[PDB]
Amino acid sequence: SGIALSRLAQERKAWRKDHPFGFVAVPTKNPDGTMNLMNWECAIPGAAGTPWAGGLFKLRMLFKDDYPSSPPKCKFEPPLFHPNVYPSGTVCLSILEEDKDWRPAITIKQILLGIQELLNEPNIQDPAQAEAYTIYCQNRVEYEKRVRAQAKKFAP
Ligand SMILES: S=c1[nH]c2cc(Cl)ccc2o1
Numbered sequence: 800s801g802i803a804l805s806r807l808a809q810e811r812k813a814w815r816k817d818h819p820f821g822f823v824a825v826p827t828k829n830p831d832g833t834m835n836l837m838n839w840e841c842a843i844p845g846a847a848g849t850p851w852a853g854g855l856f857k858l859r860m861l862f863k864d865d866y867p868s869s870p871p872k873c874k875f876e877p878p879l880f881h882p883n884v885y886p887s888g889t890v891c892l893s894i895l896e897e898d899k900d901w902r903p904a905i906t907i908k909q910i911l912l913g914i915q916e917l918l919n920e921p922n923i924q925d926p927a928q929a930e931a932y933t934i935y936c937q938n939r940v941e942y943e944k945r946v947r948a949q950a951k952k953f954a955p
Contacts, residue, residue, distance in 0.1 A: 803866040807836035810907045820844075822911055824860070837862045843911055845950050849919045850943045854950030858890075858914070860907070867903040870895045873914060880949050882921040882932040891927040892917055 807826075814824050821844035827835045839860040845851025856879060861872040873895060878888035885891060893900040894913055926932035934942045 800864055803862060803864055804836055806867050807862065811836070814907055818908060819912060821855070822915075824907055824911065837864075837866075839907075841911060843915050843918070846915065846919055850946035851918050851950050854953040855955040856918070856953055858888075858911075860910070867905075869897050870901040870905070871910065873910065880931045880945055881918060881928070882923065882935050883917055883925055883927045884931070885927045889927075890914055890917070891925055892922075893925075 811826065818824065823840070823842040825840055827838045827840055829835045839862075841858045841860050843856045843858060845854040845856070857876055859874050859876050861874070863869045863871075873890040873892075875884055875888040875890065878884065878886060883891045892913060894905060894910070895901065921931075921935055923932070923935065931942070931945075934945065
């Protein structure tokens with residue numbers, strides 16, 4: 800656990816010094832009240848001028864003991880309508896799979912910015928949920944209408 804905790808302390812220090820505006824990333828607490836660097840509560844703001852604008856989308860970031868060998872599991876809570884988000888809330892993204900594009904050097908900031916980019920540009924070769932994928936393919940106007948409604952629902 801020393802390797803993960805040392806890296807996670809480095810990430811926290813960097814994040815607090817400089818992070819993208821409107822984003823949140825904060826470790827949680829253990830039952831005894833001490834800091835739990837393995838479980839972070841995060842939020843991603845929708846990009847201005849997009850259907851996601853005005854929404855603030857809460858996500859949990861869960862680190863395994865072998866981090867940064869492995870990527871964190873990133874899970875929208877509550878789950879979101881998006882073609883590449885599983886119904887569970889888990890994000891499907893190549894940088895978040897050890898055997899795909901994860902690299903140990905990737906930072907929490909890079910992950911959250913990567914997920915923000917995913918929100919506004921789905922990967923249609925990578926569908927994780929049937930409904931959002933089907934609507935994206937069949938009617939982009941309806942898709943955006945649904946995204947706008949969701950953004951309003953999660954206005955901060
Ligand atoms: S408040 C509050 N709860 C929460 C949960 C997650 Cl996963 C992320 C951000 C949050 O803010």
